[PDB]
């Protein structure tokens, strides 16, 4: 009954890349906004806009490098059935560093590399190839 | 603990001049290389991948004279040391004392250098050493005792090693009958042909 | 495979059973010959197989296999049984050691002598 | 009694000693409190194995420990040598 909304966002991004959608619409929340902010910051999406005022909708523009999708794999790592918190040394280098792990540290949502350079760990939200 | 059998049969099973007889009469002129020592050596086999790995390991073990328990100890030591593990394995085999004796020009073979080291002839850093598998450190001085300096087989070995190639990680004096182990050899210094990747892949199973 | 179902009752290692249960986790065991007979194998092997009944020192009575061309075992002979299933023979899952307490070596043998307890022949 | 003494380690006919302070009813290599150094009687030429940190020695003797004969001799030599 929609326990996990972040995995719903990730499934929408994955299915929109697989079906070659131009843009993906979903309900928003500030966690989704932060994850989409860092997904723009690395270059997996093109951009995003948050539109509604009381029933807020978030719309993402999916990037397509000529043949493929830019996002190939994206996995929800911590899930509501099994929360996964790593330390500052256990922060994974995803796809030998070519992909990111979105980590929600105590300074907010950032990537694996910014959490390691800042010196702090936390809940890993998703691996993004 | 040594092989001590027919040596040219060991050279003929591998198909390569292992230099384990000598250099004076040529090894094809002894005879019968390209041929396995069978009664079935006229038929060459298909020789599968584990066979190929085992033959390269047997080649490297016979070209030095090391038995298998010492060789797998050398493999563990090359594996736990940082760097290319196969190059560390060849460096640890070139670091052996009797090999340094044979490369420097004392002893015409590796078995002759082993009998020379065994019979208390060679002093490394001012102390005589019995053990063939002694690791010669860099900037070590390899020399002979007083009594064993006046030994004619060392003269003949100096001559036929003058016809050899004089490897460059060690420096031979040849007149004081001394030499120094200058540095650690790299892969390009030594032998250019043997496949150490086949050896590390065997023990990695 | 749900992690809650593994927390409530975990994954179960099956059980390891032994095909040599009369040896009692020992390499060999001494027993005495109750009977020395022969039997026939299962259907594609067609021979006569020298199999002896053994009573063991722990009280198990098992059938062992006397392997090698011709033996000297009798009634009430003390032998050393070893372990190792005989594939054709049903119910036979131990071997007798040749070179044992009473069981002699095989006659006129020269290759794999130590599997049959034959001393090295001198010339 | 708390005493400072020598525990014997090392190989056969090549002894090594840990100078170590322990309750004196315990076994020779058994349960101790802290090891305040080591001693090597056969060490080599050029090799100096005799190490004593005098701070923990003086701390434990001020707490009421009892120095053994070898340990008191070794304190004498490392305290007159420096």
């Amino acid at each position: 009954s929609m326990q996990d909304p972040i995995a719903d966002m990730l499934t929408r991004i994955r299915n929109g890349q697989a079906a070659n959608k131009a843009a993906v619409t979903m309900p928003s929340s500030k966690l989704k906004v932060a994850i989409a902010n860092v997904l723009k910051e690395e270059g997996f999406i093109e951009d995003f806009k948050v539109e509604g005022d009381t029933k807020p909708e978030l719309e993402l523009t999916l990037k397509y490098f000529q043949g493929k999708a830019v996002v190939e794999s994206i996995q929800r790592v911590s899930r509501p059935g099994l929360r996964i918190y790593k330390r500052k040394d256990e922060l994974p280098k995803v796809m030998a560093g070519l992909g990111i792990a979105v980590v929600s540290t105590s300074k907010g949502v950032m990537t694996d590399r910014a959490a390691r350079q800042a010196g702090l760990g936390g809940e890993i939200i998703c691996y993004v190839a | 603990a040594r092989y001590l059998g027919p040596k040219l049969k060991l050279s003929r099973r591998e198909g390569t001049d292992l230099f384990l007889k000598s250099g004076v009469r040529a090894i094809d002129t002894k005879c019968k290389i390209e041929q396995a020592p069978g009664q079935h050596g006229a038929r060459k086999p298909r020789l599968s991948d584990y066979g190929v790995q085992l033959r390269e390991k047997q080649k490297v073990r016979r070209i030095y004279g090391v038995l298998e328990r010492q060789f797998r100890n050398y493999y563990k030591e090359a594996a736990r040391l940082k760097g290319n593990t196969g190059e560390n394995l060849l460096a640890l085999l070139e670091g052996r004392l009797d090999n340094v004796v044979y490369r420097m020009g004392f002893g015409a073979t590796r078995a002759e250098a082993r009998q020379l080291v065994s019979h208390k002839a060679i002093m490394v850093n001012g102390r005589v050493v019995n053990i063939a598998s002694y690791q010669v450190s860099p900037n070590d001085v390899v020399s002979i005792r007083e009594k064993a300096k006046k030994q004619s087989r060392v003269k003949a070995a100096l001559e036929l090693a003058e016809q050899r190639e004089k490897p460059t990680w060690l420096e031979v004096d040849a007149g004081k009958m001394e030499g120094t182990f200058k540095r650690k050899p790299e892969r390009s210094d030594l032998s250019a042909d043997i496949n150490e990747h086949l050896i590390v892949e065997l023990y990695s199973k | 495979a749900t992690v809650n179902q593994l927390v409530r009752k975990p994954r179960a290692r099956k059980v390891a059973k032994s095909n040599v249960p009369a040896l009692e986790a020992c390499p060999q065991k001494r027993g005495v010959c109750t009977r020395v007979y022969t039997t026939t194998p299962k259907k594609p092997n067609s021979a006569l197989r020298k199999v002896c009944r053994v009573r063991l020192t722990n009280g198990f009575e098992v059938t062992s296999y006397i392997g090698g061309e011709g033996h000297n075992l009798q009634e009430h002979s003390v032998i050393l049984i070893r372990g190792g299933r005989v594939k054709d023979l049903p119910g036979v899952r131990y071997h007798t050691v040749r070179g044992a307490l009473d069981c002699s070596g095989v006659k006129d043998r020269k290759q794999a002598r130590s599997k049959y307890g034959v001393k090295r022949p001198k010339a | 009694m708390v005493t400072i003494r020598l525990a014997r380690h090392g190989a056969k006919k090549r002894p090594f000693y840990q100078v170590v302070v322990a309750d004196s009813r315990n076994a020779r290599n058994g349960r101790f409190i802290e090891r305040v150094g080591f001693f090597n009687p056969i060490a080599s030429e050029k090799e100096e194995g005799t190490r004593l940190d005098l701070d923990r020695i003086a701390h434990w003797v001020g707490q009421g420990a009892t120095i053994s004969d070898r340990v008191a001799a070794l304190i004498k030599e490392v305290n007159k040598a420096a």
Binding site: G81, L82, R83, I84 | - | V3, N4, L6, V7, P10 | -
Partner: protein, 80 residues
């Protein structure tokens, strides 16, 4: 600051003592999920003052019976 554990009361029914269930949010060593484990303690209720349904701060002390080595310091969030 004294070492103090926070727990709900489970039962109040004997005399001058209560039985209190502290919950810890442990992690599973095998499977990695944070699971809730519970610990019932017999706590010494001098003055017999608190009831069945509340939360109580509790520290440990000298043994007082064959159980009951913990004592009430105070009741935070009394209940009905």
């Amino acid at each position: 600051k004294i070492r103090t554990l926070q727990g709900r009361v489970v039962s109040d029914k004997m005399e001058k003592s209560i039985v209190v269930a502290i919950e810890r949010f442990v992690k599973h060593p095998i499977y990695g999920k944070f699971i809730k484990r519970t610990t019932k303690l017999h706590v010494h209720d001098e003055n017999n003052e608190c009831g069945i349904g509340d939360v109580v701060e509790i520290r440990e002390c000298r043994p007082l019976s064959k159980t009951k080595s913990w004592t009430l310091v105070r009741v935070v969030e009394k209940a009905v």
